[PDB]
UniProtKB/Swiss-Prot annotation, chain A:
Its cofactor is pyridoxal 5'-phosphate. It is linked to Cystathioninuria: Autosomal recessive phenotype characterized by abnormal accumulation of plasma cystathionine, leading to increased urinary excretion. Pathway: Amino-acid biosynthesis; L-cysteine biosynthesis; L-cysteine from L-homocysteine and L-serine: step 2/2. Gene3D superfamilies: Aspartate Aminotransferase, domain 1, Type I PLP-dependent aspartate aminotransferase-like (Major domain). Homotetramer. Interacts with CALM in a calcium-dependent manner. This is Cystathionine gamma-lyase. Highly expressed in liver. Also in muscle and lower expression in most tissues except heart, pituitary gland, spleen, thymus, and vascular tissue, where it is hardly detected. GO terms for biological process: cellular response to leukemia inhibitory factor; cysteine biosynthetic process; cysteine biosynthetic process via cystathionine; cysteine metabolic process; endoplasmic reticulum unfolded protein response; hydrogen sulfide biosynthetic process; lipid metabolic process; negative regulation of apoptotic signaling pathway. Substrate binds at R49, Y101, R106, V326. InterPro entries: Cys/Met-Metab_PyrdxlP-dep_enz, Cys_met_metab_PP, PyrdxlP-dep_Trfase, PyrdxlP-dep_Trfase_major, PyrdxlP-dep_Trfase_small. Induction: Estrogen receptor alpha (ESR1) regulates CSE promoter activity and induces protein expression in human osteoblasts. Its EC number is 4.4.1.1, 4.4.1.2. It comes from Homo sapiens (Human). The modification N6-(pyridoxal phosphate)lysine is found at K199.
Length: 387, 388, 384, 386
């Protein structure tokens, strides 16, 4: 009952920007151009930071996958976030989601706010509340869906709609969790589709990178200027590796879905799980919303284990397939306790409100055999709660 | 008559951070660790996430720190990324004093971007010390200088400048040491708070890495920078870090050849009848030549000069070069030539270049590591081509 | 109706050799160790062994259901190394329809160091036994063949070969990959790969792989790996190991797309004949289901008309790229008579069925519609 | 009194094959081309990576210039180059190899090549009349090393070339690994093949295993080019890039290796705890005067015998703090090693004849500061003989 899959995604991920006629060798795979500078004198490239062959191939590919006209690659997701924020002036205000990635939370609240920028954390799941926070000084709205890690889902089309009623306000959707294979914020009314390519996009846990796709011509020109002016650019080798990862994004995300769905269903029917949060499950508060704006779900499964902090640790330390580590979206399965780990960078009084207790566990289900993933979870839960 | 060369420089560039006991394999060369994340909570722990820190980047930072005579170092995605990150130390309401002649991008960030966030920017000629003193306010938190400047190669008394800045209040002096490199100049040893590099140029020296480097001694200053490195995320690729560290292994023998080639080129151009004026710190004709010898252990391959005539004559010269490549950037093993007014400094107002002297006949050369004989031959023929 | 999929395959492909506890940093992904040498006072020299290559070798061995595996600079390099196992004076029985370079090595190079090479149709149970001599020490087979895709019953072949005892049976398992076929589980002594194809699967690594169970065979192979020095780069090893991580989800899509392409071509009025193991029309379709867990993306077909029609078709493709090699994420198309099998003598090319009208497709991971639409449009250009 | 330095070396090492007009982007440094295959149809271009590819060709084009050669072939390793060269022959032919060669070179000929109808004779080619006594019409290949590994015996290449080429068709190969093409050009001295282990000085950064073969003869190149593609011991394009990158600083590296190597050699000879030093740059070297005629300088390879027994050699090696106890050579880092147990353990009765005793130590002097390298040796020697 999900949105129909995007019509040329696999084809484009493999060929867009990859045209062999670009190179004198007619190579089927684009060469890695490390060169910082390029010969001028008799069009073309001037300096690597402003633009370079391998990065441009990647940006054109990602643009296509987002259904965008333009895309910009960055040193990291946070670097992309910071660059986007530099679009504004001293005196402007940013409305940010209350449950956001810790680093995003940290930048807005602790760094950006001390340069004449106003920051308001607003529950944008309450779309009725967003309008109340909007002021004539609001220039940017930052949204993330699903949120990390409580995975609450936001109506992008509804939010874009509220935001665009008051003229020049920018709507940014952090699309790190889903990827453009499952969700296209720009097609849903967003102005900017932002990624941490470090996660699902690259999908191989070996590249730190950010991506920003956009349609507005003037917004692109401002973003392209800041990309070269701030210089938070990615390595050409990282660009190549990420572009290589995109080649299998469609077949990777499908297995994440199948494995994620299977893990979520196993966990929900398990007597030692208090509650499971997974958009693909009917038990999810926004399951029907997900189906309207998304073409599927990922391998990100959040759940509460029964008992105390003690049980969550025994569970995590007895896993043999899931690796106890931060980050997500890789081919390998990851497990994590946000209260102590990825979201220790979010205030304690805010964690109590968001639901990040000592028993909330975030899983990044990988591409291993389903059987083995379930068996690993079963054995580990039995370690915390033995027969 | 230059400052004596820094001791153990080559030894440290090859060994610091490269210690084989870090790895289970006892490899002589540090592995490239691409992994974005790391396993936590195991029986019997340093790394958590690549952006915060990772093996290959850390080895590079420890090595560069040593070459700078520093305690700490931070690597970044680019020189500009390093610059922007440093500026994030400040608050809305602070003022930045910047050298009047600096790299266009440094100029551009301060004038067009930093000025959009409650920061006041004044461009001041910091070589003339009275101009700096009048610009300092109780609100001043940052002074950004570059020496030699890009591309007119103006030289600033670093130790003298630090003395003025560190007198009244908490003001940070940053020295963009891209041109010289730590082999020839140590700003931290001269009183600067930060020695900053674009590793894209001489540090890596192989024209295949875009990267910035930031060296510092102050403990609180480092912690604020280390926070911003992870919080802003302008991080370099581990593979780029490896390549740059590899470039460092030959930094000492490269810079020596850059010097020897650079001096010969400067001397050739100044005696050439088709050249109006040469600016090179190694030449006694440089207004601050004796200052250079007091602050440096030598000079690099950056040679700036004026060709006789107008813009048309400069173009014919540049297009006739066969070894020098008409291109932007600098500090690589290959020789580069460029016209700053139209190229690297087109992002500087037309009215500022005339004040700074960046006319249409000003040419910047980045002399590489090719044979001396051949580089002179290329310059000679091209000058004969410009004025036949 | 195929053989059941190999158990724990995806799990092993992602985790075997990838243990974070190997590194002081506990990185989830193994670092690329370029270091040629190591401090002594473990590893000694990169060519003999190194962390990144060794991690890859443990992974491939598991996927093969093997005890050992050796990585090499290329597929041919792996073949040459294996051939160095033999003695002066011996004979090699090699299939008549093999990869061109394999043919060339045996016929033009290997034969000159006291090695005798006889090309034999190893599918004919009576032709193989007649070719075996007490002097034969090595039998080299490839299944399915390139590009006529002839299929060999491996276990009976193993059974026939091992009756004469110490003879090595090598199966070039490049086409299928260890995800779809396990020669070692079927009685082969060596499972050999060109990792340049499906194993890496991203058209950016040249590498060979050799899997083995026998202790004595391994020690001889390991000695030769270090002695000839046709070793792969650690970065290539990393890249191939990176590619292995998605082998299971890639091969499944190659299967789904290849099947769709094969079926489209067969019902097409401008195609004379389609050769694809996944189609019931393939003469050994049922043998495939008994020894394999599925099929790959290699689709061979004859276009109606002449060489001219095959050329018009190939040059009008917009998604398929006219190029050699195979097994990458991108779709490739090729005319073996003129291209990849130009290194095989011409009159044997005619007997094998590799005419001027035989076309080989390597179907990639693109969308099915676009692949089919591209084929339709290109066929309509040849035959409007 | 050495040969004048080869002219335009720095220019060529930096520019040959590196022409920015090769790429549509006009990049100053050649891109790394990983692609295994190339689009065909529209004469122009590449077909398959193993046969040839942009990045490998640029390196080969570059190395050829530095060798003063017309052609060059890159391989997966030095040994890969060796095995490929040997494949030029047939069963029944005979190979003349230097008596003191690298352990792996010895091992291949003796244990592998010898099992395929090849005749192998180990001959002291520094005494050149021994070369003539072993030559037979069955000789198709002469493999020499100068200086030898690790006793550093020096061979008159042109003299050998004269003797070898007098008789029908014998190929003379010079393993020019120790010296660099900056310091020695075998092809200009009459050799048929200039071969390298690029793992050492050529790359010079201890992170690439690679072999190189430079050649002038047309038929010889065509036969080798066939084998490069047919045997498939090809290097990775990224490794090719890395070696080409290392090549950019080869001249300034080799000069510093020389200055450090000479100082290290001079220090050891004046040291009361060293019995004998073997270094071509030293007048005490038997072929010192020969070296000056065929070379433009010397490298950082210093071989010496320490006084005492095996235990004294161990304490010395284990007390080094700058020199690293490891195998291989030619990198920016200083290496120290005991060949009898390590790099030449694959050669024992032959070690005794060659002089590779339990007290023979081989040093690869790196690019560190001279003083620091000297102090490390000084302190470590004081440690063995306390």
């Amino acid at each position: 009952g999900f949105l129909p899959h995007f019509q040329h995604f696999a084809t484009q991920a493999i060929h867009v920007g990859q045209d062999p006629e670009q190179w004198t060798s007619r190579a089927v795979v684009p060469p890695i151009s490390l060169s910082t500078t390029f010969k001028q004198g008799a069009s073309g490239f001037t300096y690597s930071r402003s633009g370079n062959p391998t990065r441009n191939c990647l940006e054109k590919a990602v643009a296509a996958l987002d259904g965008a006209k333009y895309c910009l690659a960055f040193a990291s997701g946070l670097a992309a976030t910071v660059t986007i924020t530099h679009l504004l002036k001293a005196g402007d205000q940013i409305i940010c989601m209350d449950d956001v990635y810790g680093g995003t939370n940290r930048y807005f609240r602790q760094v950006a706010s001390e340069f004449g920028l106003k920051i308001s954390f607003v529950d944008c799941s309450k779309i009725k509340l967003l309008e109340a926070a909007i002021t004539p000084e609001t220039k940017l709205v930052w949204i993330e869906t699903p949120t990390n890690p409580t995975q609450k889902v936001i109506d992008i089309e509804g939010c874009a709609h509220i935001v665009h009623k008051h003229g020049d306000i920018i709507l940014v959707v952090d699309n790190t969790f889903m990827s453009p294979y499952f969700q296209r914020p720009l097609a849903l009314g967003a102005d900017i589709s932002m990624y941490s390519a470090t996660k699902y996009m690259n999908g191989h846990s070996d590249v730190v990178m950010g991506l920003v796709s956009v349609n507005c011509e003037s917004l692109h020109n401002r973003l392209r200027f800041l990309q070269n002016s701030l210089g938070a650019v990615p390595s050409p080798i990282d660009c190549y590796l990420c572009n290589r990862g995109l080649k299998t994004l469609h077949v990777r995300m499908e297995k994440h879905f199948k494995n994620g769905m299977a893990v979520a269903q196993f966990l929900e029917s398990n007597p030692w799980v208090e509650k499971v949060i997974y958009p693909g499950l009917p038990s999810h508060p926004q399951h029907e919303l997900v189906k309207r704006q998304c073409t599927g779900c990922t391998g990100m499964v959040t759940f509460y284990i029964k008992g105390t902090l003690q049980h969550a640790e025994i569970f995590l330390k007895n896993l043999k397939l899931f690796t106890l580590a931060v980050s997500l979206g890789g081919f390998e399965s990851l497990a994590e306790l946000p209260a102590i780990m990825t979201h220790a960078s979010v205030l304690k009084n805010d964690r109590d409100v968001l639901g990040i207790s000592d028993t909330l566990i975030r899983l990044s289900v990988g591409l291993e055999d389903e059987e083995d993933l379930l068996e690993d979870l079963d054995q580990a839960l039995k370690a915390a709660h033995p027969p």
